[PDB]
Every structure is written in C-alpha cells, then in structure tokens.
Design a protein around this ligand. Sequence first.
Ligand SMILES: O=C(NCc1cccc(-c2ccccc2)c1)c1cc(-c2cc(C(=O)N[C@@H](C(=O)O)C3CCCCC3)nc(C(=O)N3CCC[C@@H]3Cn3cccc3)c2)cc(C(=O)N2CCC[C@@H]2CN2CCCC2)n1
Ligand SMILES: *[C@@H]1O[C@H](CO)[C@@H](O)[C@H](O)[C@H]1NC(C)=O
Ligand SMILES: *[C@@H]1O[C@H](CO)[C@@H](O)[C@H](O)[C@H]1NC(C)=O
Ligand SMILES: *[C@H]1O[C@H](CO)[C@@H](O)[C@H](O)[C@H]1NC(C)=O
Lengths: 129, 132, 133
Amino acid sequence: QIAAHVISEASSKTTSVLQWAEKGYYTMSNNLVTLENGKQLTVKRQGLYYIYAQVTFCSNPFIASLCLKSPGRFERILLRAANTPCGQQSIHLGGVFELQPGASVFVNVTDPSQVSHGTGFTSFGLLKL
Amino acid sequence: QIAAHVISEASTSVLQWAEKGYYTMSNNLVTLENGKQLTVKRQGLYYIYAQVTFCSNAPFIASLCLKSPGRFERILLRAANTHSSAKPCGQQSIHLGGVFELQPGASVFVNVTDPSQVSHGTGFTSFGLLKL
Amino acid sequence: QIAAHVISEASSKTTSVLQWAEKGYYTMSNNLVTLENGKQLTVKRQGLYYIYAQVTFCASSQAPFIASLCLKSPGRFERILLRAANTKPCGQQSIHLGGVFELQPGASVFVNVTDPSQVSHGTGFTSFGLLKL
Ligand SMILES: O=C(NCc1cccc(-c2ccccc2)c1)c1cc(-c2cc(C(=O)N[C@@H](C(=O)O)C3CCCCC3)nc(C(=O)N3CCC[C@@H]3Cn3cccc3)c2)cc(C(=O)N2CCC[C@@H]2CN2CCCC2)n1
Ligand SMILES: *[C@@H]1O[C@H](CO)[C@@H](O)[C@H](O)[C@H]1NC(C)=O
Ligand SMILES: *[C@@H]1O[C@H](CO)[C@@H](O)[C@H](O)[C@H]1NC(C)=O
Ligand SMILES: *[C@H]1O[C@H](CO)[C@@H](O)[C@H](O)[C@H]1NC(C)=O
C-alpha cells in the first residue's frame, strides 16, 4: 500500500510554498512516494490517488492551494479553498487525481507567516486507490 | 477502482460540471449525466464529496442531493454560510462529504441557493465520489 | 469495510452531548460499528479511522458557539479531539470537525456543543460519521 503523510514546518525561505517534514506517525517503508526538498510529494507509480491537505492558520482572503508539477510541465492547480483562537481556522482540501510516475504535488498559501506548524495542525498526504 | 472527480462549469440552482482538465472518470461504472449528475452503475458504499466556493457577498446554502431510480429525490447533506458581508466579494469555500450507500443507477448532484455567487476559477469548485 | 453515517435528532438543553439516529439515509455498514444510546459511535475493531461531523446552528453574552469531538476509550477518561468555535435572526451556520485517529477496541466518539437548542435538525444539516482506513 502506497501512502505518505507529512507534517508542516516553518519554511525559513520566502515563498507561498509550504515546507514539510517526515515527522509522521507512519514510516513510508516503500519509497514509492518521497518528500523532495521538503516541498513536494513525488510518486513513482502511475495511479488514482486521493490527495489531501489540511491547513490551519490565524485570521485577521486566505487561500490554500494544491498544485501539480512535473519535469517539463509548469505548475498547475488541482484544488483551491478560500477563507474569510487567534482567529484560528482550517482549510481542507481533498480529491481524486490520476498521477504519473515522476509527478509531484505541493501546497501553497497566500500568507505563510499566518500558518500554524505543529503536528496536529497542518498536514499533507496521499494514498493510492 | 471506481472514482470520479469533476470540475465546475462556466454557466439554474443545480451546478454544472465538466469533463475537462484534471478530471477523472475511472470507468464506465460512473458517468456524468447532462453535465449535472454523477450516476453510478454498481451498488455499494461511496464516499461522496463536494467543494463549493462563492462570493459570500439570508444564508448561502449548498446541498448534496440524491436521485435513486424509482424514488423521488432526497437531500443528503446541506451546508449554510452566513456572510456579513463580507468584503468586496469575500470568497468562501464550503465543503460537503459523507459515506453513503448507493443503488444501481443512483445519481447525486449539488444544489445551491444563489448560482450567481459561485466561483468558477480553476480549482475552486469540484464534485466527485469514490467506491469504498 | 467499516463505516457509519448518522442523522441528527433533537435533544434537551440538559445535555451538551448531541443525539443521532439510524433513520433516513444512514449507514452502519456492519456489526463492527454501532450507534450506542443515540449518542456515540462505537467501534469493535482497532485501527485508523477518519471521523467527520458537520453541525449547523444559529444569549446572555456573545460567547462563541463551540462543537467538540470527544473520545471515550475503555478504562480511559474522556478526552477532546477537536474543537470548532464560532463568533439574524437566525444566523444559520455550519461548522465542521474531522480528522484521523487511532481508535482502540470499544472506543467511542461523540459530539459536544454549547447550545443544543440552537442546532439545526432539518434534513441533512447536521451529521456524524466515520470510515476505517
Ligand atoms: O484530511 C483528510 N482529507 C482532507 C479533507 C478533510 C475534511 C473534508 C474534506 C473535504 C474535501 C472536499 C469536499 C468536502 C470535504 C477534505 C484525509 C486524511 C487522511 C489521512 C490522514 C492521515 C494522517 O493524519 N495520519 C497520521 C500520521 O501519519 O501522522 C496520523 C495522525 C494521528 C493518528 C495516527 C497517525 N493518515 C492517513 C492514513 O491512512 N495513513 C497515514 C499514512 C499512511 C496511513 C495509511 N496506512 C496505514 C497502514 C498502511 C497505509 C489518512 C485520509 C483521507 C482519506 O483517505 N479519506 C478522507 C475521507 C474519505 C477518504 C477515505 N479514502 C479511502 C481511500 C482514499 C480516500 N483524508
Ligand atoms: C435544492 O433542492 C432541494 C431538493 O430538491 C430543495 O428543497 C432546495 O430548495 C435546494 N437546496 C438549496 C440549498 O437550494
Ligand atoms: C464537551 O466535552 C467534555 C465532556 O467530557 C467537557 O469537558 C466539555 O465541557 C464539553 N463541552 C461543553 C460545551 O459542555
Ligand atoms: C501558488 O500556486 C499557483 C500556481 O503557480 C499560483 O498561481 C498561485 O498564485 C499560488 N497560490 C496561492 C494560494 O496564492
């Protein structure tokens, strides 16, 4: 069975792209999915994947985005959710998408500083169907 | 494995969907009828989901509905948003999901109170299911 | 495949715990999940479940409306897994709680609220379910 579940970490850099860590409660033994550069999940096998994120952030429009990338292919949106305590809320994204070997999915946000990083807060993962 | 993911269509309180872009229609055991209804072919257990985004500019209500063959339609799920009021447009995403048992020929679709407020920009609004 | 979907029923402002029924278009896939005492979803088998609920709602202050997903586990005290807290008439709003959790044999989950009187019970507005992964 092919699945990764990965957890948020403060990005350090500039971008809208969230940075993730292999801090999960499961061991992706397989390698059929990998976390590259703490930014993206890259799969090795072609398939129908259920892909998800949860993004927890502080308020005071906020948009999370699940995107798809591949060598030779500009980034492309798969999913987007908008939202309008410390104002704290959650965006959840999830869907089925067909993925090819080498493909990567990643998450990006309008404001990375607003987001809450701990385990239990912001995650991102998938599982092959 | 039987699964569908369908994309919002540039448009009628019942939302339209397109088989275009990064959509998925695993097989002929699921299909999109009239660009409006996901109709399954086999009986079983389905996670069904929907995301509606809208200018939160009475509450906006999105509903998931079921047309079983031989039976009048019923509501499956509904979500309400009270939108004060809430900026220039004030985009909001509303999601509906559940585990439902479906009959051959069963079709689900998604209803909304104000079709003019829904966002069609890429990724914002989508509909699918998968067999469990 | 182990899954549940239950429907809201009205309840007294005497408990904070919400009430559910196997009525209308519900799911109780097999004997390994049940709805106990109109109130808790109880699993016979251990493992990884995705648990979701959606509650729709409308005072002496402007204290938020708050919904809590609770876990009761054999020989354990109850604990809170998730809280959603929200800041007319009436101002109909849906709030969602959900996530994935490792449940022990005979674990029970339920939903707490602030004002059960204000929760909407019209068809499809308030719901509770789970799915073993
Ligand atoms: O948030 C989810 N959606 C976003 C969402 C939420 C709410 C609403 C919506 C929405 C979208 C559109 C419209 C409306 C609403 C979206 C979500 C999360 C997870 C999930 C999360 C995690 C994860 O928190 N994990 C851990 C970690 O690692 O720290 C745990 C944290 C604490 C407990 C133990 C570790 N773990 C797993 C999981 O199963 N994992 C983890 C990695 C491998 C292992 C499985 N495994 C074990 C042995 C071998 C393999 C799965 C799975 C799934 C998932 O599938 N759903 C979601 C429900 C149905 C579907 C079930 N199906 C069946 C096959 C595919 C889809 N949706
Ligand atoms: C969609 O259809 C239902 C059932 O046919 C109807 O009662 C309702 O008014 C509609 N739901 C919404 C949210 O507009
Ligand atoms: C809900 O959860 C527990 C019951 O065990 C309790 O700590 C909390 O006070 C409850 N919430 C409300 C609003 O009563
Ligand atoms: C991040 O990704 C897309 C793809 O390039 C970009 O268009 C968008 O502006 C960014 N996402 C958000 C949520 O701003």
